Amino acid sequence: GDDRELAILATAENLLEDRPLADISVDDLAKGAGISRPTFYFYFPSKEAVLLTLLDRVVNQADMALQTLAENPTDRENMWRTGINVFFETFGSHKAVTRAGQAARATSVEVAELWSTFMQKWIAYTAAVIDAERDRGAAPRTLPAHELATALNLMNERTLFASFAGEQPSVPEARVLDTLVHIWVTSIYGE
Amino acid sequence: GDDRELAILATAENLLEDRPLADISVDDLAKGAGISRPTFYFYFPSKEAVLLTLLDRVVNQADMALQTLAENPTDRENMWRTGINVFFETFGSHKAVTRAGQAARATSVEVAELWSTFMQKWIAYTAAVIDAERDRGAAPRTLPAHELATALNLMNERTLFASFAGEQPSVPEARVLDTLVHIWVTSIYGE
Numbered sequence A, B: 001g002d003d004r005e006l007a008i009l010a011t012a013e014n015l016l017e018d019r020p021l022a023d024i025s026v027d028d029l030a031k032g033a034g035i036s037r038p039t040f041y042f043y044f045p046s047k048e049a050v051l052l053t054l055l056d057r058v059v060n061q062a063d064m065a066l067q068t069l070a071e072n073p074t075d076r077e078n079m080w081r082t083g084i085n086v087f088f089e090t091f092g093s094h095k096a097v098t099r100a101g102q103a104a105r106a107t108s109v110e111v112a113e114l115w116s117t118f119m120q121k122w123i124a125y126t127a128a129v130i131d132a133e134r135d136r137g138a139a140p141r142t143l144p145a146h147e148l149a150t151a152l153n154l155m156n157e158r159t160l161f162a163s164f165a166g167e168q169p170s171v172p173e174a175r176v177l178d179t180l181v182h183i184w185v186t187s188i189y190g191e
């Protein structure tokens, strides 16, 4: 059962579409995966270790997609658009996992640190590119890169997830990407 | 005891500096306010009704401060700076209440709706001013005002509270205001 592990993971993702993690139990994941509950414990310490793995696969997948863009070099607006779209698509394709993993930041120290580690990495990378662009004479030296990048990344976290969750207020899903790209391009190039 | 009510409210604010709401009990608020626990229930249904009132006073105070600016009319960068500073100062002066009321959005429907109501109001107001400025020929017609205003407000929510809570990553408290003002001015006036 690496089969059975993937089965447990797919079952968690499906059930998370319909209800929160506190509304799902181990017996539910077990049943769904076609195995007994003690068999479940061979794979995962708990429900929450399931969410953590689901979350970790989605963030790593966003992160790899971001590496892929990085290694293969278009106008500046589009470059930023393609980077942001990595997150809109990756998380937009896994809304139940995104939403539930963001809620679990409050109550799980491993979820909080997983998210926190990848944010620092995403911010460091955004700043490196901002700085690169300043090195080339294409963007002006205004805010420190690393502070500008931190506010931009935290914006996208809040706005993407608000859109995906249908929160009031939020930008409509169909408008969210253009909205973010406009703010990134004007703040990075203006000033 | 409107005295006793204010005493209960001050005691909650002080204890929230040192620990979370789940670490505070009614007997703690009672004791702190110099009254018995059944006397506490005359004032508040629960601990959480206390947080809700504390939160509601801070948001209304931010909101009034924002009305005050509105009724008395300086350059555009500074106008935005003064608006954002209302939030940085108001919430910055009540960090324990801010932080705990943001955590309570997850688990309390009244806290969620209080926050949600004032966000719609803050966004509607930001858009009205963006649109005004477009009417005068001072800002270009780029994004729809109301979508640009929504992403900007959600940015400030996430970034201010991350700074106040010392989160990793976050912008340093001493840099957060300039960081936000730069992004607001370039995105509203650029493109």
Ligand SMILES: Cc1nc(-c2ccc(S(=O)(=O)NCCC(F)(F)F)cc2)cs1
Pocket (backbone or CB within 6 Å): A079, A080, A082, A083, A084, A087, A119, A122, A123, A125, A126, A129, A152, A153, A154, A156, A157, A158, A160
């Ligand atoms: C072309 C480039 N894009 C990025 C880039 C980095 C991070 C983000 S993000 O803000 O949207 N990711 C962090 C917030 C999240 F993950 F919640 F979306 C967008 C583009 C770096 S270089």
Ligand SMILES: Cc1nc(-c2ccc(S(=O)(=O)NCCC(F)(F)F)cc2)cs1
Pocket (backbone or CB within 6 Å): B079, B080, B082, B083, B084, B087, B119, B122, B123, B125, B126, B129, B152, B153, B154, B156, B157, B158, B160
């Ligand atoms: C000069 C003007 N400023 C505003 C203004 C409205 C809202 C905000 S906010 O984004 O910082 N408030 C909402 C987010 C919060 F409350 F969490 F800070 C800042 C300025 C409207 S007109």
